[model samples]
Target: NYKKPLHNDYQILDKSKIFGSNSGSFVMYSMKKDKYYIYNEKESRKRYSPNSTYKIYLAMFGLDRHIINDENSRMSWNHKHYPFDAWNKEQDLNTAMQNSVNWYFERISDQIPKNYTATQLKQLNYGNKNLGSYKSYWMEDSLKISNLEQVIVFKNMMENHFSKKAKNQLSSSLLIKKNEKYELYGKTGTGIVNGKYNNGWFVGYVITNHDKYYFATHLSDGKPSGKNAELISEKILKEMGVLN
Candidate 1:
């Protein structure tokens, strides 16, 4: 039952046109230990803003530091001082993450000290990008990173190369609830830059029983929707046999 036909088509858009018209996009598929395929549009090494997708790392940091124990860890809305609206006065990290709630993350950001968070970012090869001027602003920057860098970061996460506890926390916090077979963990981000729409993202492996693989995709100047990115990524995963 898992070996269903690939539901998305790759040929819908010309490769050159798609890359040429958009800011950038990257895809990686791993079949086995060393077998893989990678596609990069434009300068694959160029750096761009990560948007909310950087939350993956933030979540990891939270978990590593015990800022939030589980997806059920609740954060209170402090919007009286902040500039965003939240659905509930209290929300769990899982719901906040799934819904991409700004206020919830903002609360967590306040838990860690600036120096400690900065040090963690430095260890992750993040501070070098000058991602954000403010401690809470890293998620809102044009931090530069290449497709290769993205894959490498994801690989480390998959292997628990950075923080083992954090990796475990991410698994419980992010993996899709409906699809246990694929073992995919990811986050989507959309924002406005220079008065134009920009999309930055992170999607990849957490764990799997069959074979482990990690991938990421990002695009700018595109509509603020996860449907397109999700479809394309799923197609690439299918073609590479990462998804049965």
Candidate 2:
């Protein structure tokens, strides 16, 4: 399943202007077709920091064990400048997730044992395994996942059963856009690799009126950009005809 087809779907466009260098790939899997299509063949297997993308699973972990209260719980903020003024105060789970506030999730992630995260990742069949250190692996160098791996994990997540409240909570939090065509759910991840803005990720799925599609895109450059990950996926989602 990892090997590229040395081909394109012909139906979906051949490429997308996802980033400056186009150093990464976009992987989309059709639940209806039970097949995957990608924009970059050689780039699909590459692994980099998942950045805030891990928040989705962090939310799942917290909900599964009831470790971090419900989504409405306002987790206290540590007195630290966490890269953004918006995150300086206490935030509820929904706000923290929406803003990708690393401080809040990091606190939750820190409380959860690394072994627990690793075990959940295995259950979920997530990337390359091991959450690395306890506090901050997914953000930078330790844990890594490819674009294709991300798509697979997301697809698996949709099919697997978790608590209804937990599932509904995570789904509601991931809602980035919704219209008559479909509802989009995803998270943005930005990673500072080697002290530069080198990895950007947006991973999620689109639930259409009829069917669903899962997607993950990674953008890499020294450019410090394309936190536009969500935007790019939206474009291709339209191109791929998942959106109307």
Best by TM-score: 2
The count of backbone overlaps in candidate 1 is 2
lDDT of 1 at 47: 60
Candidate 1 — worst ten consecutive residues by lDDT sum? 1-10
Off by over 4 Å in 1: 1-23, 29-31, 78-86, 158-163, 177-181, 206-208, 221-227
Candidate 1 lDDT, 1-244, residue by residue in tens? 1122223232222334433455456556443555434454344445655666667777776776777775457776654553343555567767777766766676677786777766765555552445455655755553555544565555655563346656666666676633656567777765566765666555666345666776766665455334455555666565556666
- Residue pairs that clash (backbone atoms under 3 angstroms), model 1: 47-144, 47-145
RMSD of each: 7.6, 3.1
* lDDT tens readout by residue for model 2, 1-244: 2443334342333665544445667888877877787777556677766778888888888887787665355887768876688899998778888888877887777788877777788887777775555558786767887887888777777665577788888888888889888998888888764667778788998889888888888787534333667677877788767896
